[PDB]
Amino acid sequence: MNPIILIIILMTVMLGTIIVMISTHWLLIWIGFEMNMLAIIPIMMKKHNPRATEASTKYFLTQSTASMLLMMAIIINLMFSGQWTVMKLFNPMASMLMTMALAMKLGMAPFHFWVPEVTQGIPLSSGLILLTWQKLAPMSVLYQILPSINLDLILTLSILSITIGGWGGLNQTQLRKIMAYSSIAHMGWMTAVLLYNPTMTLLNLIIYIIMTSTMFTLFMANSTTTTLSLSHTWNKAPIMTILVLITLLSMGGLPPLSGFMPKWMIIQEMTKNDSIILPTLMAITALLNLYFYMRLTYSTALTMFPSTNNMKMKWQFPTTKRMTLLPTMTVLSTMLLPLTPILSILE
Amino acid sequence: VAAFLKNVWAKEPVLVASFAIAGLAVILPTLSPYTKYSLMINRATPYNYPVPLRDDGNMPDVPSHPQDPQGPSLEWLKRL
Amino acid sequence: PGIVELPSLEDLKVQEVKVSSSVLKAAAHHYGAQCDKPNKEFMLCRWEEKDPRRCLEEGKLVNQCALEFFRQIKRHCAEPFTEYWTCIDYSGLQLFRRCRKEQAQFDKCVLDKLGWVRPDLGELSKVTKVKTDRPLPENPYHSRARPEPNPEVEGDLKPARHGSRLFFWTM
Amino acid sequence: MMTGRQARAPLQFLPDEARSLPPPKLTDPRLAYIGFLGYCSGLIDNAIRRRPVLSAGLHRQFLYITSFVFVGYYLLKRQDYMYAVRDHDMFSYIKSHPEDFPEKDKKTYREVFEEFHPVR
Amino acid sequence: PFFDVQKKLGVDLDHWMTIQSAEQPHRIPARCHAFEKEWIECAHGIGSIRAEKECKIEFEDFRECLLRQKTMKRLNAIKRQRDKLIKEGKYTPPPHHSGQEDLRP
Amino acid sequence: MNLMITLLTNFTLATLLVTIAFWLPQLNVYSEKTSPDPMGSARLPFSMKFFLVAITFLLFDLEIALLLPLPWASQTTNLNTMLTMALLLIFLLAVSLAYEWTQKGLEWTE
Amino acid sequence: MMTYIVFILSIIFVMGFVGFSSKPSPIYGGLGLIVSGGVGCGIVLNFGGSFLGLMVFLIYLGGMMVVFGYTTAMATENKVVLGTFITGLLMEFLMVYYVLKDKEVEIVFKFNGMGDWVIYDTGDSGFFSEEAMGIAALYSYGTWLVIVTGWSLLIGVVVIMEITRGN
Amino acid sequence: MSLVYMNIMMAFTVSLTGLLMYRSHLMSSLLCLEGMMLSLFILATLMILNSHFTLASMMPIILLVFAACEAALGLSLLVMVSNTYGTDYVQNLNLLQC
Numbered sequence A: 001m002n003p004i005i006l007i008i009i010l011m012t013v014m015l016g017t018i019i020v021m022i023s024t025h026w027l028l029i030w031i032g033f034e035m036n037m038l039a040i041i042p043i044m045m046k047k048h049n050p051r052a053t054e055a056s057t058k059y060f061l062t063q064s065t066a067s068m069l070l071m072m073a074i075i076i077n078l079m080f081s082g083q084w085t086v087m088k089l090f091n092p093m094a095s096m097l098m099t100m101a102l103a104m105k106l107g108m109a110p111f112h113f114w115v116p117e118v119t120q121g122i123p124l125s126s127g128l129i130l131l132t133w134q135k136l137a138p139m140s141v142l143y144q145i146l147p148s149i150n151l152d153l154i155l156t157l158s159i160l161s162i163t164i165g166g167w168g169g170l171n172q173t174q175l176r177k178i179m180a181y182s183s184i185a186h187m188g189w190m191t192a193v194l195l196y197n198p199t200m201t202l203l204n205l206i207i208y209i210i211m212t213s214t215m216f217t218l219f220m221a222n223s224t225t226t227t228l229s230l231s232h233t234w235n236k237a238p239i240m241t242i243l244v245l246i247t248l249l250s251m252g253g254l255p256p257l258s259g260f261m262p263k264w265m266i267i268q269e270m271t272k273n274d275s276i277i278l279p280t281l282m283a284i285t286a287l288l289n290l291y292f293y294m295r296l297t298y299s300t301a302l303t304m305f306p307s308t309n310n311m312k313m314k315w316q317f318p319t320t321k322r323m324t325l326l327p328t329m330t331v332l333s334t335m336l337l338p339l340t341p342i343l344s345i346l347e
Numbered sequence B: 001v002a003a004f005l006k007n008v009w010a011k012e013p014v015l016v017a018s019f020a021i022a023g024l025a026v027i028l029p030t031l032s033p034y035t036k037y038s039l040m041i042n043r044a045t046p047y048n049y050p051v052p053l054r055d056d057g058n059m060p061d062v063p064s065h066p067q068d069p070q071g072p073s074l075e076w077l078k079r080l
Numbered sequence C: 001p002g003i004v005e006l007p008s009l010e011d012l013k014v015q016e017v018k019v020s021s022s023v024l025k026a027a028a029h030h031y032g033a034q035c036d037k038p039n040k041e042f043m044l045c046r047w048e049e050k051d052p053r054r055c056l057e058e059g060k061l062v063n064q065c066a067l068e069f070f071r072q073i074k075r076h077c078a079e080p081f082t083e084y085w086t087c088i089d090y091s092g093l094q095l096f097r098r099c100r101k102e103q104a105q106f107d108k109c110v111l112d113k114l115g116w117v118r119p120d121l122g123e124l125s126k127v128t129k130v131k132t133d134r135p136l137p138e139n140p141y142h143s144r145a146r147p148e149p150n151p152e153v154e155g156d157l158k159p160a161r162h163g164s165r166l167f168f169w170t171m
Numbered sequence D: 001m002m003t004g005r006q007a008r009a010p011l012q013f014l015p016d017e018a019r020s021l022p023p024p025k026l027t028d029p030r031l032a033y034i035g036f037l038g039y040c041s042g043l044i045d046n047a048i049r050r051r052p053v054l055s056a057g058l059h060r061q062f063l064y065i066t067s068f069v070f071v072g073y074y075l076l077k078r079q080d081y082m083y084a085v086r087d088h089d090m091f092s093y094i095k096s097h098p099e100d101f102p103e104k105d106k107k108t109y110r111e112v113f114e115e116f117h118p119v120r
Numbered sequence E: 001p002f003f004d005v006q007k008k009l010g011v012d013l014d015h016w017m018t019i020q021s022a023e024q025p026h027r028i029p030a031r032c033h034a035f036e037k038e039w040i041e042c043a044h045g046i047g048s049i050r051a052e053k054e055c056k057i058e059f060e061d062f063r064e065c066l067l068r069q070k071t072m073k074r075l076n077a078i079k080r081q082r083d084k085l086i087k088e089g090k091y092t093p094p095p096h097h098s099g100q101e102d103l104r105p
Numbered sequence F: 001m002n003l004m005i006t007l008l009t010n011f012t013l014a015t016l017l018v019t020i021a022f023w024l025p026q027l028n029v030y031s032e033k034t035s036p037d038p039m040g041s042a043r044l045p046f047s048m049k050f051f052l053v054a055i056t057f058l059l060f061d062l063e064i065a066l067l068l069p070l071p072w073a074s075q076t077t078n079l080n081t082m083l084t085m086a087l088l089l090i091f092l093l094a095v096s097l098a099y100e101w102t103q104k105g106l107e108w109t110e
Numbered sequence G: 001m002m003t004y005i006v007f008i009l010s011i012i013f014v015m016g017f018v019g020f021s022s023k024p025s026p027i028y029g030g031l032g033l034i035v036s037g038g039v040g041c042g043i044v045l046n047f048g049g050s051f052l053g054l055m056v057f058l059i060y061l062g063g064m065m066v067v068f069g070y071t072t073a074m075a076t077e078n079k080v081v082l083g084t085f086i087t088g089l090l091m092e093f094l095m096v097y098y099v100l101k102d103k104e105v106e107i108v109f110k111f112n113g114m115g116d117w118v119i120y121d122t123g124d125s126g127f128f129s130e131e132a133m134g135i136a137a138l139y140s141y142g143t144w145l146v147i148v149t150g151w152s153l154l155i156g157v158v159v160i161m162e163i164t165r166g167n
Numbered sequence H: 001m002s003l004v005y006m007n008i009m010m011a012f013t014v015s016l017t018g019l020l021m022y023r024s025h026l027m028s029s030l031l032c033l034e035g036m037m038l039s040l041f042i043l044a045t046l047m048i049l050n051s052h053f054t055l056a057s058m059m060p061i062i063l064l065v066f067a068a069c070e071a072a073l074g075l076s077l078l079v080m081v082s083n084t085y086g087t088d089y090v091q092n093l094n095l096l097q098c
Ligand SMILES: CCCCCCCCCCCCCCCCCC(=O)OC[C@H](COP(=O)([O-])OC[C@H](O)COP(=O)([O-])OC[C@H](COC(=O)CCCCCCCCCCCCCCCCC)OC(=O)CCCCCCCCCCCCCCCCC)OC(=O)CCCCCCCCCCCCCCCCC
Pocket: A256, A337, A338, A339, C168, C169, C170, C171, D025, D027, D028, D029, D030, D032, D033, D036
């Protein structure tokens, strides 16, 4: 791909997210999602292989169905309110359809069935874009319509996402599918605290984006897409195994790491509202994703591995890959918990 | 500036006429004196009813009849 | 809610201007010239009251002044007006531009026998002022009392009392 | 929660009333922790590119510490501002609604009857 | 997040198509211009929580202008009782509702 | 209403003439034919260039759809803004054509 | 019977979608969507949206379904289909019988059973179609809308030329 | 409310159920998607014309244009699938299950 055209297409992805973030009219929200989808389709087809065409077709169909449901929700809002402001909705049917459509755009359960496939078919940088930047716009629309969001629907979608993201990644050896089920579980964690405190939703979104960006940047720095190729990293660069160690421990929620920061605050904002059972079983399910993270770093990151002779050629060359923001993102994804009251800047 | 222009006029006269007419269409309304009158005629065209004003007592610039000499006129349009 | 009040059928009886649209269109410039004041009192009352039930009598004055407009044509210049609205009436779009000599005969006979000057280009579209005696409607929308706004922020901004107060963070 | 507050003057990182609040000192322990995060970032940057960790790029580690302290100073100003706004709204709401926060009568323990549970 | 760039920069990107009460071409009113204006002027500034309970009557008048469910319900009741009295024969239509009176203006 | 009468009449006359054409020589008992093409039985290969010119038609037809209210838009009172956006839309159609040009998309059906 | 003509077209419109969502083939699916676009366009034209009806004919049918039939020709050379067809048709005709015997129905929303000629307006608009002047307002009031739509179509051209290349 | 709105929404839900669970040609899925767009066009048009809300008359054209561009994008994906398998059968899109 021509780098000028790549810059233009990435600016169009960013422009669609910005149009969803800033616009007051529902048609411009829909336009921003259309622009974002239309622009992100070539980023997935960067390498031009049939897995990326399958992934882009599945992503197209899911985001197009979600966009049609979003426009039907906007249209029922126009029936029952005669106007177009991006605020609370004026019909529970529009509320249900827009919550369903945004759940399809995020990849929340029961519409999760594309997120492990599409992330598998596309490269690591486009999977980084999909799992970080493509979460910003529907969380903004959910942030603005929360007076109309049905609590039972958003909590059903949230805990279904957390259970399916927990019990879907236990079986996984592919790193992109582990990140995709982790995505589904974290979107459940973001949307369950949405009607209680949306600032903690934003906190979970930013800490998730930092940790996911750290993980995909380490994946691009090591060129590892599987568990077993990740095991061959200590004999090439030993620090990269340490960084995927501390960042995967952070994404499951170990104290005293920074990825313990959001969900603890989320539990802290769900017991204020007298919900005890729900964050309890929610973090019970998060213990399962932490547990396969601890298998996936105990059994296959710490204790050192059989290597191959051609690796001794790769000792003679350093990494010339641009590891952009990787030490900053690794420090922020691990050592940020002593600054836990920074969350007030997101209020 | 005239070697490349004669070269493209010998090779691609369709595109020379295209870029020239497009350039004229862009720059020429900023140079025409009649572009003001387009605006003036499109605001002088009464699609709606001229809703009258309640006479408060002091509106000298508002007429009391259509045939009164004060108010907006269209003699600039009748002459042109 | 309530019962919507409607006027009786005797309150709606007025002698109608029972002429065709080409007849109205033929004399329309002299109509807007000569029947200015009751028409504008009616349209002022109609945009201000926002209610046609409050605009019946002024409307009757319109239908009083239009008929006297046509009687004053019928007493003096019935034949050039008839020759003019017939030519207006032939056209499917009712063009003024196809009918200029009949317009000239009608305007000549009207200026001679009635002294009426036809309005120029741009006169009948003027915003004019209307001196009436009826009072200004203090609530034309019948709006109820608006809800009181929330209290605004006042007072100088003090620091947070012992910081964030988040579990053990002392700042 | 407080999104109707910063909607009258939107997209202000630090508003004008934030200048009425005491800014953090440069020896703020939060800001010192942020500078330590910058030093850790410089060490991880020399570690991932196989440089001498404590030796190479002292200007680069200096810009890491400088840039994290620089960003974190304004982040801590906004943090302190938002907790100050939270307490200001809390206190003005309690003052504007005296019926909802009644001064409950303080009873000393000579009137308070607590049930004694013996450990035996 | 709603980063309000339009108010921060003072530009009008899409506030104009947002409501029916806004400035239309050639001053065309919507059918429920007055009702939407009344409900917007009721609910302005008081927040959505106070607006859902303190501007219920304006919003019901505006939603019933939009959908005309009460009006169609009343027309259904009148037309159904009229059809019943036509089938029973206790009512006859007048000449101005049968089309025999050569309309007014 | 008269429009639907006209459309229905044209469809009726077309269906009448097509039915008479398909069934006036079927009165004949001519002969029964067994009759046991440039390609024989090969599958039709996909032509990428035909699809590219169809999508280029679709996208320029959408840009035409944006251009269609211009005779009504020339009647506005905001003529500077209107003229600017009209020249911007025709320029963006020209830029889409220039990108279709220079990236060899208009080749072998140029 | 002529008073319900919009309603009658709407029934055909529903039938038309059950005509092609049963999906015997993309060929006949395209044919059913073209007939459905025609009858829904008749629905649009009967409310006074003449320009939007000609946008259905020029752009949806004449522009886009041509490209669907073209790609169906070039790229794509029962029991489930007929069963889903007759199932949806029985559902729709039972809905028609309900709403015509009751003049009131509730599936998701409450719906009146009289014709939609009642819900119109009794005024006039002078020397213009309001829908025509509202679409003319795209160039005077709709500046940001024109900008984002033109940029989306330019990006659409660029994106199609990227992913159809295969290199 | 209006009775034609029920038929347009029922058409939308018919084409939505036709999109969701069939596992057939990919072109048939794109046809169901554009039937959903068609019903959205008709419904937006009848509402905006019903309420005489003049500035939203340009709204369905926008709803047309973007989505038709969307449709073009989908066809190109189909063509890439049609350049990979020779068919648009969506059960050929099962490489990413493992
Ligand atoms: C006239 C104008 C100029 C005047 C100049 C005057 C000053 C001149 C000297 C300039 C230097 C000033 C240094 C900062 C001020 C003092 C800070 C302090 O002692 O805080 C006490 C602070 C609480 O004690 P305090 O009695 O309440 O306050 C006494 C002071 O008034 C402290 O003030 P405070 O009461 O306002 O404390 C506020 C609050 C007090 O804290 C609280 O209210 C509780 C919340 C604390 C966070 C808890 C997080 C727990 C989960 C995460 C654990 C992470 C793993 C542990 C560390 C592993 C390695 C990174 O702070 C926070 O919440 C912020 C977080 C803690 C930051 C502490 C400063 C760190 C700078 C150096 C970083 C190096 C690593 C330090 C340890 C990192 C972990 C904290 O202690 C701790 O939280 C324990 C950690 C140890 C303190 C850090 C000592 C700084 C110097 C370290 C030198 C050695 C470095 C060795 C190499 C690197 C490590 C491997």
